[PDB]
From a paper:
When activated by several agonists, including adenosine diphosphate (ADP), thrombin, or collagen, platelets adhere to the disrupted surface, and aggregate upon binding of soluble fibrinogen (FB) or other proteins1 to agonist-activated αIIbβ32. Previous studies have shown that the three current anti-αIIbβ3 drugs are partial agonists, i.e., they trigger large activating conformational changes in αIIbβ3 that enhance receptor binding to physiologic ligand, promoting thrombosis. Ligand binding to β3 integrins triggers tertiary changes in the A domain of the β3 subunit (βA domain), comprising the inward movement of the N-terminal α1 helix (reported by movement of βA-Y122) toward the Mg2+ or Mn2+ ion coordinated at the metal ion-dependent adhesion site (MIDAS). This reshapes the C-terminal F-α7 loop and repositions the α7 helix causing a swing-out of the hybrid domain underneath the βA domain, which converts the integrin from the genu-bent to the genu-extended conformation, separates the transmembrane and cytoplasmic tails, allowing formation of the integrin–cytoskeleton interactions that mediate dynamic cell adhesion.
We traced this unexpected effect of a ligand to a stable, key π–π stacking interaction between the indole derivative, W1496, that immediately follows the RGD motif of hFN10, and the β3-Y122 in the ligand binding βA domain of αVβ320, a conclusion supported in a subsequent molecular dynamics study. We therefore substituted S1500K in hFN10 with glycine and replaced the ligand R1493 with the longer L-homoarginine (Har), changes that we predicted would not adversely affect FN10 folding or the π–π stacking interaction between βA-Y122 and W1496 of the new peptide Hr10. To elucidate the structural basis of pure antagonism, we determined the crystal structure of αVβ3/Hr10 complex at 3.1 Å resolution by soaking Hr10 into preformed αVβ3 ectodomain crystals (crystal packing of the αIIbβ3 ectodomain does not allow access of large ligands such as Hr10 to the MIDAS). Hr10-Har1493 forms a bidentate salt bridge with αV-D218 and a cation–π interaction with αV-Y178 but does not contact αV-Thr212 (which replaces αIIb-D224). Hr10-D1495 directly coordinates the metal ion at MIDAS, with Hr10-W1496 making a π–π stacking interaction with βA-Y122, stabilized by an Hr10-W1496 S–π interaction with βA-M180, and by a hydrogen bond between the carbonyl oxygen of W1496 and Nε of βA-R214. Bound Hr10 prevented the activating inward movement of the α1 helix (reported by β3-Y122) toward MIDAS, and the conformational changes at the C-terminal end of the βA domain that normally initiate integrin extension. Superposition of the βA domains from the αVβ3/Hr10 and αIIbβ3/eptifibatide structures shows that the S1500K/G substitution removes the predicted clash with the αIIb propeller. Thus Hr10 acts as a pure orthosteric antagonist of αIIbβ3.
Numbering used by the authors:
A (entry chain A): 1 to 835, 870 to 954
B (entry chain C): 1417 to 1506
C (entry chain B): 1 to 690
């Protein structure tokens, strides 16, 4: 929120040269001046016979605003033979990748082509040039003896580049191995020490590189983007690369070990063609000293209010925990076709609040589709999803979109103001903009009134105009402000004082300043940075007694303060900015003495009473929890009376009750400021004598830890009086209860088997599943619908195996689904066959007993039983033409709950499944 | 190694050819067959066969005038990459 | 009497109308102070004010034209008008609503022009052969469904630039297939060859004149071709009065947007047509591939139906791609393109099987509600579409339009239209907020002469501090305790204290943390309820006690959506017909069913019990599902009476049941992968003998 959009640094290269396609800082150790590195592909150079070779210009902050191209190659095409070039170098897009460590500059040409030195070809291998001081080497790891598309010929190395913490580059190329992609990592010293101008294919020691994979991984574009950061405990920066076309164009992001190039973690986009992985970045966004992942999907389509798809793009924010897998949240875009996640750029700690901040840019959104850059501040809880500042493109769209924000770079303090700054490139208008951060000043102001209670008959001070004693009081406004970075010693604050802010344009004033004789006043103040909370005084003479008829209305003293733009730095127009979320004003209230007894002080007796309409609160779901509050003041008036409702972590307060007349409305607001959650309700200012008020507050509880017996609610009344200002804190609790609606269901598939079986013959010893009979399938489901869950339960199955020493339903096999184990008291499928009412009573009984694990609300346990109707036993002699109803029952018993130290006391039910065989 | 090693003629009755190659080790996407007119101005022509079929048929030749037949194997990579042109003269 | 308008409502003529749609204002040409100021026209009328001085605008849903739904849309007089009505005039007062209806019909014979977009990479050489006479073969099949047919052809390979294009050796530029020892033509981005014409032999003439090219990377850019064939309607010749079908035939993967950065192409695709007189997509090398969103937008605007005709190896890729482009259908294409002639007819059936309304240029100040009537008389609330229809059916939709407040936006109109159709329902919305008596405007000094006041519609609101009909209301010891009207109930506090009573008008003080309004300072902002700690869930304005939910939000807390897309299952039915859809979440009704769309019910009866209800009403013409006339809507399965219950049990279920004739019927249920489900029925069931 502290970026200056008024006077930024504008830079412009030649038109048509994509000036700004890639930007970075340059902070050499050899000097104190810091520079800008702006790549410019498609730029015509002095290279002989090379058209649009591309440049990387060095722009300075010396206020001359002049960019000088950096000499990297300066030579034309080397020759494989006479009139047979080895390289082509034209339209090579040199400068599309620019990244710089302390004193070294790395630029690449992803569209550089090669002759391959074996046959006559033009393969976009890509090349890079690493420059350190005067020496300049060529780093082309993809220019090797692996030639064709199955090799590295189309790799386009240098498409995305980066440095690690200790002198090691991370290079990506999307065209290796039929466009599978590749990551190549090399030591900076190895790149310089092993360079040989007479060797085109150089092998480096300690080169980490990904290898070719199965053909199903083709056309994945690994190495499209690169980011570095530590994701294990090794301390070495690991490799992060986006794979936008991976997994059927779902998009993936790979994380390789920065030590032995082994897979560490993964990410996958939820939507196809969203280009999940177009942009990646790694930063500690929560101050945890653990790097967090950021992934851009510019073409992600979300759902609007209507529900139709709209392309707004989303950014994947993954917080790394010290234990393992990340905590991933989503951040959708704002405008359609804006491509919100096209560029993700970390910028140090922008506001210097102790947590790093990041910037996400939509190059094609905003007014006239000029481009928007959003700034997101980090917090203790992670990344704040609400943007704090928007940066708008300022240039036209002559030929192509300006693409303001297509490339960004931060986390470097180009001036000495102590705050990191940001570079934004356009490349559509061939321009780059530098935004400098402004210092942040956190200011707190106090307001006091001597005294807070006024007596009209107690006139002491003399009016300046005519000598008459007037009732008076004092008001003091102290002001202290400080901040970090470079900001001036003394700050110019302009403060305004307003007496009786409540009454306004049409009303009585009731209070004016002593000398000015006016209800308002202004003061020019000037304080110092560290401490020294300066104050001033003008004293508040009260109006003539018994002249306004309006008492019981508190005279609210209101102070608002601004900051004059006078004091700034030598930065030529970079003025500070106050803290983001800080009150620009503060109010105090005085009261006229009225009905405070013969002691001239109002001593009330506040009381809180709450009964329990609700009795039980069930674990596992939200539920209405209404509390009835009875606030009464038996005593003299209580100034600024408020009801303080301290709530637990599970409260989630919502609204107040309106539908009753026995309890009236109230003015309540949820707020948490200092280490505690609570609900404050206004009880009248002042809350006069008697005043028995009834009200209700609604809550929906999300229980905690599954072991708590109750939930805590402490209530009391507070006031501004000097004596007996509060009420006895009254606590009310409601017990957590366990309720679990568990049901058991069953069904037969099919529920009918007509006789005779078509095309059936009897084998005396069959193993067919066909010579036995039709397949009868019983499915039993134990489902827990109730809010509370249970940890252990027992299920008993009764199966009519035989009847008069012959089989009824030969069970082939049974399967389980969910947290359950089962065991049959008789061996299932003993014959190794491979693919009126007869119950488990009068007939032979086969039991299957099961143990059930933890079942929550949305989960159940299912037992599939595939059996065979033994056709031999039916239809033969004793059961020739008779209707039999094969009956199987199943009962369950819940025996344990995870909520120990709480009443449970039972759960049990049962059901039965029937399979009727009939004749005709 | 990306080439089948087979395809000597089978079923030489009609004014056609029935050739049969044998299982290249690498996965095969398609098969390409060319034919015609060894020593003349070469009216060459082709047709496509899916990689699961190991046989093909040709048409439109003279009464056994000793054509030349070639077969290609198509890699499942890129748009259309191939190689290994095994040939026979029949 | 005092319902809502008499008290808490009397501010001015324009504010009286904004309180409730039932309020009314009067200018009675006299001064019977009383309370005939702003009141219901059943009470204000009894207050003896009706020389047409009553201002009570009524919300109007008048139709401006409604042509009858035609029967056959080919040939004769004019104006097929497959949508009725066409233009209606909506007139709404603040915070009011009216409702209307719309009927759409798939005409019996509607002209169809189909454009063949074909991949010409080397894997399609076999396909280009068998498509030689499939132009006239497609003529005879489409002649049955449509008498007026048009066909056109288009070609695409990929972007002709590295790394996609064979750039070297120079010996292979006119012949990108050089190592193959054959000859192909140089590759092209998109090539339009034959414009839409009614000569089916002309199609076969341009075919076999085309030849096949070669590319280097497997993803072939056809989205460039799809985008151009859609927005170059002038070049290719889309009939503005015919059904547009664009068939996309390819066997490999496709390039998506942002893939062109490898080739150095960083300019986003624009929805503009760039195919020139050379019939080649000129911007192919300079412009990136189009995204799904931009393709969806222009596909809907040009009313083009995109048909994906791809092979089984890549059909699942285009299945998921089509899910992101609603209204498009995918079909299995044989390796040699021998199935395209049948696949086109099958796709046109699916396209004409559904009707879904789309809204364009809708002002966000008003929201639309939908009750759909797809079946005979059964209404489906919340739905704006109908599924499972045959050509000739007619469906109905009822729509309600409600406004939050009322703007002065100059009566902008909007469109309601089914997707892919030319005919549409245009709604002209008008807002009548202000009163007709404001035109006179009676500026300052008529009855509030000095201390400049005003006069408007029979009342005076005089200056900053003076108040009431009579005036000066001044800021000094002027001391009325007003009475009994600054508070109701005869004994309540003074003006429900936020600001006190000064001369009775209750100038509400303590204006902070929101504004305080209302005649007794009764109203305010920020006084609504919370759901997750956010007031009205952030989805509704707070109007003095209550949330005015934004568009597509309903309920007291405005936390209930009107979206039915999250309720939609994969088969098409919302919640699989096993439960209702409330606030975008299903609530299953069938016992033992659960899940997001109630798709999981392991304890439900098998398919034998469900599918036998069709074989009863379809084959025996009786039983349930017949008396409701819903037999041949829910029963889309192919049924054929056969014998012996054949052997092929790849994935099938044999089902036996006893009908009311006390006979045993046996049938089967089979399906091809991701296709249709057919029903075999054994003829001559078993009945009791003798
Ligand atoms: C994040 O996502 C990444 C993206 O998927 C994950 O990377 C992937 O991890 C997979 C699991 O390790 C890995 O699958 C393994 O691949 C290797 C490849 O080596 C092969 O060596 C052979 C000779 O060169 C060839 O494979 C033969 O066999 C395969 C069948 O497996 C045939 O299809 C081939 O035609 C060929 O005949 C290949 O050329 C290839 O170079 C395999 O060796 C592994 O085999 C393992 O499984 C078999 C049983 O199926 C075991 O017998 C054997 O001992 C191995 O354990 C795996 O198939 C993917 O290749 C890899 N992909 C990429 C792009 O990196 C990453 O793991 C994930 N990380 C996390 C943390 O989630
Ligand atoms: C929008 O917000 C309101 C208020 O926060 C929600 O109202 C609550 O809705 C539930 C049902 O969803 C009501 O029923 C309560 O939940 C249990 C669950 O088992 C039910 O069995 C009981 O009947 C119980 O009353 C609840 O009373 C109601 N009010 C509360 C919690 O204060 C509403 O559900 C929200 N809507 C959406 C779509 O989020
Ligand atoms: C770099 O110089 C080349 C010189 O060829 C420029 O290319 C020519 O640009 C003009 C107008 O833009 C065209 O009419 C010519 O056809 C181009 N030449 C060729 C061979 O096509 C190029 O525009 C220059 N680029 C920059 C950024 O200055
Ligand atoms: C009567 O009024 C005087 C003056 O307004 C009060 O004396 C002030 O007391 C406050 C602290 O309570 C001091 O900050 C002021 O400086 C005092 N003003 C003076 C001394 O002029 C006094 O407290 C009031 N009440 C009495 C006298 O009972
Ligand atoms: C089902 O049987 C398993 C095997 O004995 C029980 O043990 C679980 O799984 C492994 C053994 O493979 C143990 O090391 C775990 O400690 C067990 N897990 C849990 C959650 O207890 C398992 O407990 C049995 N489950 C039930 C419901 O009876
Ligand atoms: C769609 O049908 C529903 C059916 O309920 C209509 O709902 C209205 O709102 C009340 C509130 O419950 C219902 O009880 C009534 O049936 C309806 N009110 C009436 C008819 O005055 C809804 O209005 C219908 N919408 C449209 C656009 O027709
Ligand atoms: C459904 O029909 C019969 C069940 O009676 C099964 O019959 C098989 O297929 C044919 C047709 O009857 C015959 O060859 C035999 O009766 C059976 N096959 C063999 C090899 O014996 C048929 O399989 C059943 N199909 C399903 C899916 O249940
Ligand atoms: C790679 O990562 C670390 C080496 O620092 C080690 O813990 C791990 O086992 C290594 N694995 C392989 C396969 O090299
Ligand atoms: C005073 O600060 C509050 C926030 O604390 C802000 O809402 C208000 O606009 C400021 N100015 C006033 C009350 O004049
Ligand atoms: C089987 O017969 C019993 C007899 O009481 C009946 O209750 C049950 O519903 C029948 N099962 C069927 C028809 O599936
Ligand atoms: C068992 O379930 C039935 C309903 O299926 C219910 O009426 C009965 O009260 C339940 N009994 C127990 C002990 O859960
Ligand atoms: C609104 O109700 C139905 C549809 O819901 C509609 O047909 C009818 O004309 C409307 N009624 C009124 C009174 O506007
Ligand atoms: C298509 O989507 C479905 C679910 O959305 C998924 O199961 C399937 O794997 C997807 N197919 C492909 C090829 O991605
Ligand atoms: Mn590491
Ligand atoms: Mn972190
Ligand atoms: Mn920060
Ligand atoms: Mn700075
Ligand atoms: Mn007292
Ligand atoms: Mn292809
Ligand atoms: Mn083909
Ligand atoms: Mn391609």
């Amino acid at each position: 929120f502290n970026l200056d959009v008024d006077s930024p640094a504008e830079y412009s290269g030649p038109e048509g040269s994509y000036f700004g396609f890639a930007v970075d800082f340059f902070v050499p150790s050899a000097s104190s001046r810091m520079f800008l590195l702006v790549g410019a592909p498609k730029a015509n150079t002095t290279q002989p016979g090379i058209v649009e070779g591309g440049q990387v210009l060095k722009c300075d902050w010396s206020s001359t605003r002049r960019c000088q191209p950096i000499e990297f190659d300066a030579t034309g095409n080397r020759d494989y033979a006479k009139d047979d070039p080895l390289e082509f170098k034209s339209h090579q897009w040199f400068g599309a990748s620019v990244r710089s460590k302390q004193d070294k500059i790395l630029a690449c040409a992803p569209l550089y082509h090669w002759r391959t030195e074996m046959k006559q070809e033009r393969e976009p291998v890509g090349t890079c040039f690493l420059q350190d001081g005067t020496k300049t080497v060529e780093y082309a790891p993809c220019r090797s003896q692996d030639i064709d598309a199955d090799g590295q010929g189309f790799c386009q190395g240098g498409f995305s580049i980066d440095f690690t913490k200790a002198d090691r580059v991370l290079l990506g190329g999307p065209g290796s191995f039929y466009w599978q992609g590749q990551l190549i990592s090399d030591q900076v010293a190895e790149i310089v020490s092993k360079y040989d101008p007479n060797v085109y294919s150089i092998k480096y020691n300690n080169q980490l590189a990904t290898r070719t994979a199965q053909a199903i991984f083709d056309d994945s574009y690994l190495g499209y983007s690169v980011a570095v950061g530590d994701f294990n405990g090794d301390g070495i920066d690991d490799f992060v690369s986006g794979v936008p076309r991976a997994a059927r164009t779902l998009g993936m992001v790979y994380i390789y070990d920065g030590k032995n190039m082994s897979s560490l973690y993964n990410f996958t986009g939820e939507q196809m063609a969203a280009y999940f992985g177009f942009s990646v970045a790694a930063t500690d966004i929560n101050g945890d000293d653990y790097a967090d992942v950021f992934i851009g999907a510019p073409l992600f389509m979300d759902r609007g209010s209507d529900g139709k798809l709209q392309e707004v793009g989303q950014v994947s924010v993954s917080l790394q925990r010290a234990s393992g897998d990340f905590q991933t949240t989503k951040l959708n875009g704002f405008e359609v076709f804006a491509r919100f996640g096209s560029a993700i750029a970390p910028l140090g700690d922008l506001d210097q609040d102790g947590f790093n901040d990041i910037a996400i840019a939509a190059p094609y959104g905003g007014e006239d589709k000029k481009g928007i850059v959003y700034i997101f501040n980090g917090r203790s809880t992670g990344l704040n999803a609400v943007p704090s500042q928007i940066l708008e493109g300022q240039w036209a769209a002559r030929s192509m979109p300006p693409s303001f924000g297509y490339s960004m770079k931060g986390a470097t303090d180009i001036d000495k103001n102590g705050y990191p700054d940001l570079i934004v490139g356009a490349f559509g208008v061939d321009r780059a903009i530098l935004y400098r951060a402004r210092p942040v000043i956190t200011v707190n102001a106090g307001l006091e009134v001597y005294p807070s209670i006024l007596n009209q008959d107690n006139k002491t001070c003399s009016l300046p105009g005519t000598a008459l004693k007037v009732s008076c009081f004092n008001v003091r406004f102290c002001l202290k402000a400080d901040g970090k970075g470079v900001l001036p010693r003394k700050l110019n604050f302009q403060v305004e004082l307003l007496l009786d802010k409540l009454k306004q344009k049409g009303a009585i004033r009731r209070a004016l300043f002593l000398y000015s004789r006016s209800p308002s006043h202004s003061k020019n103040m000037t304080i110092s940075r560290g401490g020294l909370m300066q104050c001033e005084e003008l004293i508040a003479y009260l109006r003539d007694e018994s002249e306004f008829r309006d008492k019981l209305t508190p005279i609210t003293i209101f102070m608002e303060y601004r900051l004059d733009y006078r004091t700034a730095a030598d930065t030529t127009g970079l003025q500070p900015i106050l803290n983001q979320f800080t009150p620009a004003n503060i109010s105090r209230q005085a009261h006229i003495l009225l009905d405070c007894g013969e002691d001239n002080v109002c001593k009330p007796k506040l009381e809180v009473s709450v009964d329990s309409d609700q009795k039980k609160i069930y674990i596992g779901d939200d539920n209405p929890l209404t509390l009835i509050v009875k606030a009464q003041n038996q005593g003299e008036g209580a100034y600024e009376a408020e009801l303080i409702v301290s709530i637990p972590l599970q409260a989630d307060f919502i609204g107040v009750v309106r539908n009753n007349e026995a309890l009236a409305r109230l003015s309540c607001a949820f707020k948490t400021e200092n280490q505690t959650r609570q609900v404050v309700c206004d009880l009248g200012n002042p809350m006069k004598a008697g005043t028995q008020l009834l009200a209700g507050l609604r809550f929906s509880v999300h229980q905690q830890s599954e072991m708590d017996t109750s939930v805590k609610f402490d209530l009391q009344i507070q006031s501004s009086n000097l004596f007996d200002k509060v009420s006895p804190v009254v606590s009310h609790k409601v017990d957590l209860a366990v309720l679990a609606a568990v049901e058991i269901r069953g069904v037969s598939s099919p529920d009918h088997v007509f006789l005779p079986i078509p095309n059936w013959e009897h084998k005396e010893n069959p193993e067919t599943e066909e010579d036995v009979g039709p397949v009868v399938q019983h499915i039993y489901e134990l489902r827990n619908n109730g809010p509370s869950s249970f940890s252990k339960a027992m299920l008993h199955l009764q199966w009519p195996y035989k009847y008069n020493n012959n089989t009824l339903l030969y069970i082939l096999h049974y399967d389980i689904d969910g947290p359950m184990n089962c065991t049959s008291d008789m061996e299932i499928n003993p014959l190794r066959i491979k693919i009126h009412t007869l119950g488990c009573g009068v007939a032979q009984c086969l039991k299957i007993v099961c143990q059930v694990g933890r079942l929550d609300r949305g989960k159940s346990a299912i037992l599939y039983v595939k059996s065979l109707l033994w056709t031999e036993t039916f239809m033969n002699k004793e059961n020739q033409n008779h209707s039999y109803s094969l009956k199987s029952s199943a009962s369950f018993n819940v025996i344990e709950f995870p909520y120990k130290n709480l009443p449970i006391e039972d759960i049990t039910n049962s059901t039965l499944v029937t399979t009727n065989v009939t004749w005709g | 190694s990306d080439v089948p090693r087979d395809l000597e003629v089978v079923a030489a009755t009609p004014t056609s050819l029935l050739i049969s190659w044998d299982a290249p080790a690498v996965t095969v996407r398609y098969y390409r067959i060319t034919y015609g007119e060894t020593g003349g101005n070469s009216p060459v022509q082709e047709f496509t066969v899916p990689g699961s079929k190991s046989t093909a048929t040709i048409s439109g030749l003279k009464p056994g005038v000793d054509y030349t037949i070639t077969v290609y194997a198509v890699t499942p990579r890129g748009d259309w990459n191939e190689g290994g042109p095994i040939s026979i003269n029949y | 009497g005092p319902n809502i308008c008499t008290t808490r409502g009397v501010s001015s003529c324009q504010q009286c109308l904004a309180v409730s749609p039932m309020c009314a204002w009067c200018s009675d040409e006299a001064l019977p102070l009383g309370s005939p100021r702003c009141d219901l026209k059943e009470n204000l009328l009894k207050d003896n004010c009706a020389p047409e001085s009553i201002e009570f605008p009524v919300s109007e849903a008048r139709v401006l034209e409604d042509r009858p739904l035609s029967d056959k849309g080919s040939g004769d007089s004019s104006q097929v008008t497959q949508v009725s009505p066409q233009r209606i005039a909506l007139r709404l007062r603040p915070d009011d609503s009216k409702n209307f209806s719309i009927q759409v019909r798939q005409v019996e014979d509607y002209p169809v022009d189909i454009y063949y977009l074909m991949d010409l990479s080397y894997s399609m050489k076999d396909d280009l052969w068998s498509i030689q006479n499939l132009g006239t073969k497609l003529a005879t099949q489409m002649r049955k469904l449509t008498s007026n047919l048009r066909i056109g052809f288009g070609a695409f390979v990929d972007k002709p630039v590295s790394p996609y294009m064979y750039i070297s050796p120079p010996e292979a530029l006119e012949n990108p297939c050089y190592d193959m020892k054959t000859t192909c033509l140089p590759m092209f981005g998109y090539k339009h060859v034959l414009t839409l014409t009614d000569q089916v032999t002309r199609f076969n003439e341009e075919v076999k004149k085309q030849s096949v090219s070669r590319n280097r990377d497997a993803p072939e850019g056809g989205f460039d071709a799809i985008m151009q064939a859609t927005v170059c309607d002038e070049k290719i010749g889309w009939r503005n009065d015919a059904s547009h079908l664009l068939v996309f035939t390819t066997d490999a993967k496709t390039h998506i947007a942002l893939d062109g950065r490898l080739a150095g192409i960083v300019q986003p695709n624009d929805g503009q047509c760039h195919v020139g007189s050379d019939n080649h997509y000129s911007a192919s090398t300079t412009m990136d591939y189009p995204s799904l969103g931009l393709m969806t937008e222009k596909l809907s605007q040009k009313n083009i139906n995109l048909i994906f005709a791809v092979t089984e190896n890549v059909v699942n890729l285009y299945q998921n791609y089509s899910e992101l482009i609603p209204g498009t259908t995918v079909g299995v294409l044989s390796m040699d393109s021998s199935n395209v002639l049948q696949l086109i007819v099958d796709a046109y059936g699916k396209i004409r099987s559904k009707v879904e309304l789309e809204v364009r240029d809708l002002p966000e100040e008003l929201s639309l509600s939908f009750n759909a009537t797809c079946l005979n008389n059964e209404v489906i609330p919340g739905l704006k579409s109908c599924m499972g229809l045959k050509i000739g059916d007619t469906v109905s939709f009822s729509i309600e339009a409600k406004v939050r407040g009322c703007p002065q936006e100059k009566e902008k109109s909007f469109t309601i239209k089914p997707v892919g159709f030319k005919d549409s329902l245009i709604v002209q919305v008008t807002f009548d907020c202000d009163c007709a008596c404001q035109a006179q405007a009676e500026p300052n000094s008529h009855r509030c002469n000095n201390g400049n006041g005003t006069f408007e519609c029979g009342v005076c609101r005089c200056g900053p501090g003076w108040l009431g009909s009579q005036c000066e209301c001044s800021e000094e010891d002027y001391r009325p305790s007003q009475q009994d009207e600054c508070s109701p109930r005869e004994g309540q506090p003074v003006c429900s204290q936020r600001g006190e009573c000064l001369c009775g008008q209750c100038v509400c003080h303590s204006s902070d943390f929101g504004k305080i309004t209302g005649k007794y300072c009764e109203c305010d902002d920020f006084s609504c309820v919370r759901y997750k700690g956010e007031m009205c869930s952030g989805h509704g304005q707070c109007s003095c006690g209550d949330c005015l939910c934004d568009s597509d939000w309903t309920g007291y807390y405005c936390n209930c959506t009107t979206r039915t897309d999250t309720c939609m299952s994969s088969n098409g039915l919302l919640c699989s017909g096993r439960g209702k859809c409330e606030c975008g979440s299903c609530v299953c009704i069938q016992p033992g069913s659960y899940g997001d769309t109630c798709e999981k019910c392991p304890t439900c009866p098998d398919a034998c019990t469900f599918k036998k209800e069709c074989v009863e009403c379809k084959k025996f013409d009786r039983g349930a599902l017949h008396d409701e006339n819903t037999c041949n809507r829910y029963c889309r399965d192919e049924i054929e009476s056969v014998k012996e219950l054949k052997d092929t049990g790849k994935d099938a279920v044999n089902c036996t049941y006893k009908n009311e004739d006390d006979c045993v019927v046996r049938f089967q249920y089979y399906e091809d992968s991701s296709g249709k489900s057919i029903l075999y029925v054994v003829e001559e069931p078993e009945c009791p003998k003798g």
